[PDB]
């Protein structure tokens, strides 16, 4: 009935064309709302077996009945282009919904509604185009989900997207507008980590796509997600979120379209000037959308539209008369059918994902959390975001990061060698590298998502914690170079404080550990001379 390819010639079966595309309606009831892959609202069902299960039913994506408060931000006579913000609507206690001229419309505002309460079908403005056509603007707009929402310019990766998780921000940074992947494999704290990312990343709006990887995933979404609170405001997280759902019972077509629906809604909040995080966990439900197309995508080339999906991520100068910037960053769950990867990252094009956080079950079982393998993870955005860190937070950010990574790489080499020849023949220098590498692992990489302080680590705290550790490293190598025994260094009281600094809120108290470290090594130099 509705199609991408234009219905000129009529095919066999009885099918009535609509001269329209598969589209979404945009705002201002997108927030707090739960759809399927074609933006049909949710249908709650009786428990019966399992706990809960849902299906999409044909109905309006946005309520026509509710009255929204419109504040005008333009006047009669103002010249206007696509993306220009002609009003505002408090959609939610956190998010102001910006009402924008649809793309491809420009001209003079000849009529705009005064401040008041209106439903979304009400015309709140009229624009006269250069040819004199009068266009009626409402509080919502439609867009075809399979077409990039346009923008002026895609900016190169530059600003990090602060997650507040030390291992990510320091070693494997995501950029605002960037593309990241995480394994879908269960039993390694993926749920804690995705949860932390949604809650703490400095995006104003979150779009979450998957909700049916487990049999009892729908019930957890419907029951718990309304209880979850945005820790930055104290208000519900649902109030800055939009949920899309993919399940075994929903049709194959809806789930294929789900990522396009999601990223279109993301692009729409981007266009307002917001930073948006699009998070996809529907990988197994999305993957089984693979279908028999026995006739006549093809053996010539695989489904490379997944490249074009990830291609829609980015930070952009948006449409509009004012200079304005917004972003969609993508964090997607990926998984192998078998145990080994089976070439899933090299399957899709030539590495469209620029960041990979390798959740690792062995790390999980050793209680190292978050369980991100610091040897198999990568980010191609380290050089792209370093200047932001250098200029705003710490001039030595990249140098410290590289130095800490080098120590971790050395640690890994030594542990392998030691596995063979034992630890007893290790020189002091080597033992010192292992001591400090262990401190890096325990005092910096490991982070406690369940702790009131350490659930989030501000940029300033990250660099200060790093300086403390690397200053301890420098002093350690300086000390053994002067024949101070490593047993003595391993027993320095300040080590104990460095171990707990992650639980300290006051960054100045953490910073003072540098001097405290520097004056206790002196009490060792006094005990051993020179």
Curated annotation (Swiss-Prot):
Membrane topology: Peripheral membrane protein
Entry GO CC: plasma membrane
Keywords for this protein: ATP synthesis, ATP-binding, Autocatalytic cleavage, Cell membrane, Endonuclease, Hydrogen ion transport, Hydrolase, Intron homing, Ion transport, Membrane, Nuclease, Nucleotide-binding, Protein splicing, Translocase, Transport
Principal localisation: membrane
Alphabetical list of InterPro entries matching this protein: ATP-synt_VA_C, ATP-synth_a_Xtn, ATP_synth_asu-like_sf, ATPase_a/bsu_AS, ATPase_F1/V1/A1_a/bsu_N, ATPase_F1/V1/A1_a/bsu_N_sf, ATPase_F1/V1/A1_a/bsu_nucl-bd, ATPase_F1/V1_b/a_C
Substrates-to-products reaction catalysed: ATP + H2O + 4 H(+)(in) = ADP + phosphate + 5 H(+)(out)
Subcellular location: Cell membrane
CDD domains (alphabetical): ATP-synt_V_A-type_alpha_C, ATP-synt_V_A-type_alpha_N, Hint, V_A-ATPase_A
GO molecular function, one term: proton-transporting ATPase activity, rotational mechanism
One annotated GO biological process: intein-mediated protein splicing
EC identifiers of the protein: 7.1.2.2, 3.1.-.-
The record's account of how the chain is modified after translation: This protein undergoes a protein self splicing that involves a post-translational excision of the VDE intervening region (intein) followed by peptide ligation.
HAMAP family named among the record's database cross-references: ATP_synth_A_arch (MF_00309)
Assembly and interaction partners: Has multiple subunits with at least A(3), B(3), C, D, E, F, H, I and proteolipid K(x).
Note: The intein interrupts the ATP-binding site.
Similarity-based family: Belongs to the ATPase alpha/beta chains family.
Name by which UniProt lists this protein: A-type ATP synthase subunit A
Record organism: Pyrococcus horikoshii (strain ATCC 700860 / DSM 12428 / JCM 9974 / NBRC 100139 / OT-3)
Phylogenetic classification of the source organism: Archaea, Methanobacteriati, Methanobacteriota, Thermococci, Thermococcales
